[PDB]
Design a protein around this ligand. Sequence first.
Ligand SMILES: Nc1ncnc2c1ncn2[C@@H]1O[C@H](COP(=O)(O)OP(=O)(O)O)[C@@H](O)[C@H]1O
Ligand SMILES: Nc1ncnc2c1ncn2[C@@H]1O[C@H](COP(=O)(O)OP(=O)(O)O)[C@@H](O)[C@H]1O
Ligand SMILES: Nc1ncnc2c1ncn2[C@@H]1O[C@H](COP(=O)(O)OP(=O)(O)O)[C@@H](O)[C@H]1O
Ligand SMILES: Nc1ncnc2c1ncn2[C@@H]1O[C@H](COP(=O)(O)OP(=O)(O)O)[C@@H](O)[C@H]1O
Ligand SMILES: Nc1ncnc2c1ncn2[C@@H]1O[C@H](COP(=O)(O)OP(=O)(O)O)[C@@H](O)[C@H]1O
Ligand SMILES: [Cl-]
Ligand SMILES: [Cl-]
Ligand SMILES: [Cl-]
Ligand SMILES: [Cl-]
Ligand SMILES: [Cl-]
Ligand SMILES: [Mn+2]
Ligand SMILES: [Mn+2]
Ligand SMILES: [Mn+2]
Ligand SMILES: [Mn+2]
Ligand SMILES: [Mn+2]
Ligand SMILES: [Mn+2]
Ligand SMILES: [Mn+2]
Ligand SMILES: [Mn+2]
Ligand SMILES: [Mn+2]
Ligand SMILES: [Mn+2]
Ligand SMILES: [Mn+2]
Ligand SMILES: [Mn+2]
Ligand SMILES: [Mn+2]
Ligand SMILES: [Mn+2]
Ligand SMILES: [Mn+2]
Ligand SMILES: [Mn+2]
Ligand SMILES: [Mn+2]
Ligand SMILES: [Mn+2]
Ligand SMILES: [Mn+2]
Ligand SMILES: [Mn+2]
Lengths: 362, 364, 362, 364, 362
Amino acid sequence: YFQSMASSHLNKGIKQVYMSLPQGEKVQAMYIWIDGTGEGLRCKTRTLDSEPKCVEELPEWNFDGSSTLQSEGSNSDMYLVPAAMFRDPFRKDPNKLVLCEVFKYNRRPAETNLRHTCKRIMDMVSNQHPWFGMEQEYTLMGTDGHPFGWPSNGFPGPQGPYYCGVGADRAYGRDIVEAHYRACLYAGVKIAGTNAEVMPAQWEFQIGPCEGISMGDHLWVARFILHRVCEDFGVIATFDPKPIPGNWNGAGCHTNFSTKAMREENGLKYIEEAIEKLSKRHQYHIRAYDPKGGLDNARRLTTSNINDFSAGVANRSASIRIPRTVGQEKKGYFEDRRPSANCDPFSVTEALIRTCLLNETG
Amino acid sequence: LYFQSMASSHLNKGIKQVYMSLPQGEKVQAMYIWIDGTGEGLRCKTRTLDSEPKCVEELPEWNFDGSSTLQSEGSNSDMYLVPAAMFRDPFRKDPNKLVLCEVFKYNRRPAETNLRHTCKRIMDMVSNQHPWFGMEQEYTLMGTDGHPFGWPSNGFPGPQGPYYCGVGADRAYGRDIVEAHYRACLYAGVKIAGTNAEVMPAQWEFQIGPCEGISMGDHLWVARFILHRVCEDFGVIATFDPKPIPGNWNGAGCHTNFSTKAMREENGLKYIEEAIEKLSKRHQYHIRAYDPKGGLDNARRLTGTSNINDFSAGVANRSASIRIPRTVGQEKKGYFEDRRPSANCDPFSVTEALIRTCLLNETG
Amino acid sequence: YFQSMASSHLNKGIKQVYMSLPQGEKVQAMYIWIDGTGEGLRCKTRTLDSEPKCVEELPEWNFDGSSTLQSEGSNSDMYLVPAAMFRDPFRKDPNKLVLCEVFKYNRRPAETNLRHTCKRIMDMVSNQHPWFGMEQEYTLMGDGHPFGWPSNGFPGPQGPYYCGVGADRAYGRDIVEAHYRACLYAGVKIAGTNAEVMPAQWEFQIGPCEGISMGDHLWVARFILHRVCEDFGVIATFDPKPIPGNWNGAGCHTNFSTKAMREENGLKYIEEAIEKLSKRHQYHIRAYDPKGGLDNARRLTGTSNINDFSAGVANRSASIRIPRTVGQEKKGYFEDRRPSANCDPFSVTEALIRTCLLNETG
Amino acid sequence: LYFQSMASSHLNKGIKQVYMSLPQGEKVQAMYIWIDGTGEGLRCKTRTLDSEPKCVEELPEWNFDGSSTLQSEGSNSDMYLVPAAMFRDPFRKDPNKLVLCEVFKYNRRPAETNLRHTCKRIMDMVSNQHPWFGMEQEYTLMGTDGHPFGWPSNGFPGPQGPYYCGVGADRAYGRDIVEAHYRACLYAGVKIAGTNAEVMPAQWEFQIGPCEGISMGDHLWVARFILHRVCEDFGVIATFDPKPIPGNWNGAGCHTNFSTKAMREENGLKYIEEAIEKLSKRHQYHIRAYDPKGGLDNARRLTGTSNINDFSAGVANRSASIRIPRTVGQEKKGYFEDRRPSANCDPFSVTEALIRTCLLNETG
Amino acid sequence: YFQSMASSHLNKGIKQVYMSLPQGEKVQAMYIWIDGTGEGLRCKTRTLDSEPKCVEELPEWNFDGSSTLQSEGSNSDMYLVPAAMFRDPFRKDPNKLVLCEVFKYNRRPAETNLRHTCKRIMDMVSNQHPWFGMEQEYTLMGDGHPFGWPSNGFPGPQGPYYCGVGADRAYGRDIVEAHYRACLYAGVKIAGTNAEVMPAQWEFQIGPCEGISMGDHLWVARFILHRVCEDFGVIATFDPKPIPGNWNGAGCHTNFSTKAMREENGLKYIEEAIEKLSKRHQYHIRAYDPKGGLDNARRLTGTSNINDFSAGVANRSASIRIPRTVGQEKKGYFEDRRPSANCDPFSVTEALIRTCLLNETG
Ligand SMILES: Nc1ncnc2c1ncn2[C@@H]1O[C@H](COP(=O)(O)OP(=O)(O)O)[C@@H](O)[C@H]1O
Ligand SMILES: Nc1ncnc2c1ncn2[C@@H]1O[C@H](COP(=O)(O)OP(=O)(O)O)[C@@H](O)[C@H]1O
Ligand SMILES: Nc1ncnc2c1ncn2[C@@H]1O[C@H](COP(=O)(O)OP(=O)(O)O)[C@@H](O)[C@H]1O
Ligand SMILES: Nc1ncnc2c1ncn2[C@@H]1O[C@H](COP(=O)(O)OP(=O)(O)O)[C@@H](O)[C@H]1O
Ligand SMILES: Nc1ncnc2c1ncn2[C@@H]1O[C@H](COP(=O)(O)OP(=O)(O)O)[C@@H](O)[C@H]1O
Ligand SMILES: [Cl-]
Ligand SMILES: [Cl-]
Ligand SMILES: [Cl-]
Ligand SMILES: [Cl-]
Ligand SMILES: [Cl-]
Ligand SMILES: [Mn+2]
Ligand SMILES: [Mn+2]
Ligand SMILES: [Mn+2]
Ligand SMILES: [Mn+2]
Ligand SMILES: [Mn+2]
Ligand SMILES: [Mn+2]
Ligand SMILES: [Mn+2]
Ligand SMILES: [Mn+2]
Ligand SMILES: [Mn+2]
Ligand SMILES: [Mn+2]
Ligand SMILES: [Mn+2]
Ligand SMILES: [Mn+2]
Ligand SMILES: [Mn+2]
Ligand SMILES: [Mn+2]
Ligand SMILES: [Mn+2]
Ligand SMILES: [Mn+2]
Ligand SMILES: [Mn+2]
Ligand SMILES: [Mn+2]
Ligand SMILES: [Mn+2]
Ligand SMILES: [Mn+2]
């Protein structure tokens, strides 16, 4: 598969003229789901008679699973169940985005529905109020399948000046980042921040703190919003953990994590206990942390090493880093730096709970 | 060697504007800004706040990865950001903020390129004398091929003469950047005093001032950030190099105007002339404070518009190290102009040197 | 010197977003003056604490005369004294444009400050209320070939372009429309516009303006035109003969009346003024361009020929024309058709007063 | 105003070469060349002959339309062409010929721009003194937009210095024209003595000489024709304007070297110095003979590389009106150099003036 | 100074038609000399009545030294004395190329005439028959970025380009092939070629050349390279470090033997010569580029470091290398790896003789 240039050269002002027409009483709801790859998002739209006040008043829907690698033509309809509702930043109020769970012909969860089991697990431990903060790293890619703004058939200068950089020779693609940030605020996604990363054309947004199942919900809708923003601009966002081989930064999805007890005074005690637990389960977490069970991360994890578990205060080379502020106040949260940028947050967050809170072993 | 990238400037800017039009809701963006391991480069990142801060004191401390800015090691990387000065964000609009910070190491001591820490102390020592500064930031707009903006491909425009304070498609190159920057600075609350085209084509200038004490450095550094961010939108680069094009093409400085309460009062020329006398004994100390390479950058500029090895002063003399403007000479009160600072100086280093020499009576 | 392409290829939509930010309580004042060439306009901007209500509230300023061929680097400061204030059409209310007179280090007028003596002369005859109306002709230039002309060649022969309409007749009307509106917003007394005979050649009229204000309004109208052309990436030339041969030249025809010429039977005093003009032709030719005649020498071939004085009613071939309506009604004004398009209006208007009203000879 | 046309240079030149390869048979082409009503422009046309002429005397008279060259009226238009000098045609190859002609009016008197007629008579008057001339034709290669060939679009290259006798993609602009012209002139039988790059980028030079008497003008004019025809194939223009680019860019001349039998014999410097003395009394007459506008063209060049109003001479002095080359000074025999002639002079006018002043002892 | 595009877009087929015309009996001689920079080559052409059979039949000539920074306009003539003649590869038989020595108005050598003293030194040791072999490294440049490199960026890291083959490794071989053939036709003693480590970087070797002929052949080989590059519209740079950082620098390594070093057990005299070299390192660094060391200072970081002298067998990190074969066979030559690519060979070869054979000190 290749990028297609034609759409980005369409006249965008014409579109804005149409989008300015007042739409009347009817409401658009764009249903969003995960396909048979476990990585690709799909969407379509229905008109509703009036504005829903919450996710619960959205009707069930369905799609053709024989066109998403999930079912067979002769018995095709698959189920969509509203999970999380947001305001649509592409169409504006009263219009909605709806992230859904997918079920089979028999009402059984689809194989790539990882939210179903994750929600049960989060319910088991809600008394401990688990909070997550995920740092989505990504690379903008241009037309030729080469990173956005890089020289054709070539490389820019060595890494160094791009991290948190400003100027036409440092920051590539800030228009995407700015529009995504604002789109997430309007939607009601819990976007905590942004920065430029170390590889040129590589960028980052943070989603959090989100309690339990809302983590995966917010991150998946944030990813959807990014791809749709990028589409408008004609560029591609990749969550590949090592888009360019060699001495060019990979992309992760660092997962920050705390429990009520970790956040309370001297909760550093419970942080260290959780890290201890994680230290005995490194390979299980590696298999949960990218969609190919570790094969994607093997291209990135030279930052920490893929075979080795480590932990330390302010150590950006360790598997797990305790932020310096957390080490100082003796409470807060810790950072798992192992998740690949293309991980599924429902898989990552469930594994943390199972290892750290439900004391599963193996 | 780093080149610019053309791609970002060819993105559809009307698309960005439609997204920037969405009402953002109750949350507020704060972009923290700081100086990196080179002492010249600016860095930034953004967090979301619960509500609008009413003053810099309400903003939280933060941190960053110093191993990615040439400031710390990867295994012990977190470095501190402590808010110093807050402005309105002209790129995102109210309720959003820009936050210039100081940088501190893992052990809470100031980073090597944190020159505001000692400068603020010095300004506190002399606050009763109310030191005011005005700085004239000269710069050159550069294109995409490392060649000045608007210049012929692989060549030169006509000789210097018509471009200074010039008007027209064949005189003024890049006024769009200038106009946008002036308005971005007024919206932000940066104390922008004025603008002009300079003598080299594609070279411009803005003045920041009069700023009391430590606010000079603050306002200057935020003004430079704004300029980099404006040029970024347009796909051009601003260089503060003191001699971007060798030969008979104008260099770039950061002329620093200065007065105390006593120099501003009637007959304060007496105190202006005393301060200039102290400066004449410390030429070389000021040259080492007046660019990031200790004089090496200015050596390409200060040829004879003063020579780098000779100290001079005179009324209305744009060839001297120090100029007394004619109006100050006539009125027998005001300020004087140090024309020595390189365009790429750090205002914290320049302001502090002037105070140490002229007011704290240091020698050597 | 050549035009630079690049600024016209900057994204003008970006600038407009920045200019839409509310500026607050500070005010920009752009000071404008004439340089050592006597034809070049220079400008720069200062921030003010509040909005001035008339010109006399604005402060004196100064500039580097060593960068404008007016003084030496070692003693470089030159004075700017505000003379006339307008509203700024480029930055809007409350921002101002301010035409200044230039003075030397010793407070004496600069060589190219012709306003100083002109104002004194206008004051000596205030009771006769001289009004002036000036017709500024100019050509829009691209590469410096006229704007819209074939690359390395020529459009069809003159005939259809005068007051013309259509893609094949009117070259550059965008400029003309923007300029007209900018002048109305500024408070410049713009009286009308038209397309002239040479393709890419256009005209605006400033007037009727009393005494010293003619020079002020016309100089500010010229600055407005250069700045408007700048935005569009084109150049305006007031050269009297930009293209040699059988292509129209460019004048600044100067219409002139006193209170007496305007009252009933004022034609008597018009004819009396033209009679005084007939004896002083070479004096006026030397006043009527910055090279003392050598510029007009390229235009005044036949149009009147440079060394020959003539007057007639409705005669567009004469040095002086009395318009048909003025002849019919026996009152009004007459037209001096001799001034080059690059004349200084201070110089032209002073010469008319000295000859026609102060009865000077030699 | 006339511009060049780009279309002809984009035609497929390999196609032309295939046709030019056909053996042409027994018939011969003769291209007649003459000077038009401006005194500067060359014109040509071609006839077919029955066989190859062995000398210019075997070529027939011809004629043309003088109403189309600014020389005669449409109702009585035929004008005469009388062969003066024959060369081999380097554009069509042997057996084909180039024929420089004199122009004569309907009444068989010489055209107003026929300056060879009187010049030939003068040369006959002094043939016993064997006047030899060598002329240094300077010229500038111009592009397609009236701007010098290779120069940046709407701009200037780096300052003069490296381009004189220069080598490299960033020094030598247009050497293809030069190399082709040199070979075209040798094939033709034009007495080409040498070439060099000049001080302005895109400016070159060739020498024609030593030519006795009237052959100087002949060989020079045919060399210029060859140069125009070569540049035409390549799509560039050669200008003989004495100052194509105003300011600190080199002008173009046609330095005229000159000797008689007596100046060439041992101790002939004595006769060189006598001739230079006669020239010093007639500076203004020679300036009026030395460009087609009587001095007006050279006024843009001769600024001070001699001033137009002052006569000077010196050994090895490239700032003087007349230079005695060092080798001539040393050897006490040879020639001297008149550096005054404009690149656009007519060699018939220059050579004749030198003879009239130096040998026929005319005054005024 | 910038390259000019236009000449490379001229129709080169047109030129070849003209160069195919039989020239007749006259002969072109192109005289070549070194200018006031000590690095720039200058040339011009005279017609001769017949073909010279050796250099001594060619006449003296002269040039304008005021246009080459060697003399003043009012006394401008400088002498050219033919030194070495070659066949002209650009114009063919019977046409010649002629390297000259330059002299002042008073017959004394020009400041940048280093051949004069070098020849005298070579004559003092003719019986020892010094041979030299020089390895000229250079980079092909476009806009001045290296030729074939990405616009505003960088090719992949060094490794595959050395002695490389393929569109993705060898940049500019057309030049190298044409140059090699032109040198063989000329009679220049070209010994070989290769692609070097930096992409667009190449090398030719001239030698073994006895005494003064080394400087002559290498200077003529450099002129041939500049003229060949000119045809192709590219530029050759002998700068020692054209691209900063981790991109190969450029030397002119100088191999050196006397008759004694070449006979059996000559290694003894090699080692003896290197010993004399070890005491005079700074002398040679000052001889070994035109800025007396300041150019080599950009290259001699580590390659040897500028202030440190070292020698070893097969050591490409040393100042002096004794090749492996020379060590094995106990006879031959040694390599001085210190000379910058922009050295004057007259200067280098003279220094070797003075130090190693005339036993000079200080
Ligand atoms: N108590 C907490 N529990 C879980 N996550 C948290 C907590 N406090 C903050 N976070 C989240 O941690 C994340 C930190 O991301 P970031 O600022 O990129 O840190 P760094 O770059 O230092 O790793 C943010 O998403 C934030 O919302
Ligand atoms: N009393 C003062 N002390 C310090 N600075 C001052 C004082 N008065 C004015 N200034 C500042 O001096 C600067 C003058 O800059 P500019 O107008 O570029 O002057 P010039 O170009 O004539 O050197 C402005 O920033 C202004 O705010
Ligand atoms: N009484 C008057 N005194 C001076 N100028 C006048 C008077 N009445 C009109 N004018 C001016 O004369 C000018 C006429 O210009 P225009 O319409 O171009 O005339 P035309 O093209 O017929 O010569 C206008 O500027 C107008 O304001
Ligand atoms: N005895 C002579 N009489 C006339 N001309 C001569 C004589 N000897 C040489 N010449 C000519 O003088 C010209 C010298 O031109 P050139 O080499 O450009 O000299 P420079 O550039 O030093 O002025 C050549 O045309 C040459 O043929
Ligand atoms: N006896 C010798 N004396 C001087 N130079 C020699 C001798 N033998 C060979 N050479 C020269 O030494 C040079 C070796 O260059 P090259 O093949 O590039 O070597 P390397 O790449 O191994 O250093 C060639 O110019 C060759 O002619
Ligand atoms: Cl849809
Ligand atoms: Cl950010
Ligand atoms: Cl301004
Ligand atoms: Cl023909
Ligand atoms: Cl040549
Ligand atoms: Mn982060
Ligand atoms: Mn990150
Ligand atoms: Mn990182
Ligand atoms: Mn992190
Ligand atoms: Mn200033
Ligand atoms: Mn300035
Ligand atoms: Mn200045
Ligand atoms: Mn200043
Ligand atoms: Mn009119
Ligand atoms: Mn008109
Ligand atoms: Mn008209
Ligand atoms: Mn009129
Ligand atoms: Mn010459
Ligand atoms: Mn010459
Ligand atoms: Mn010359
Ligand atoms: Mn000459
Ligand atoms: Mn080698
Ligand atoms: Mn090598
Ligand atoms: Mn090597
Ligand atoms: Mn080697």
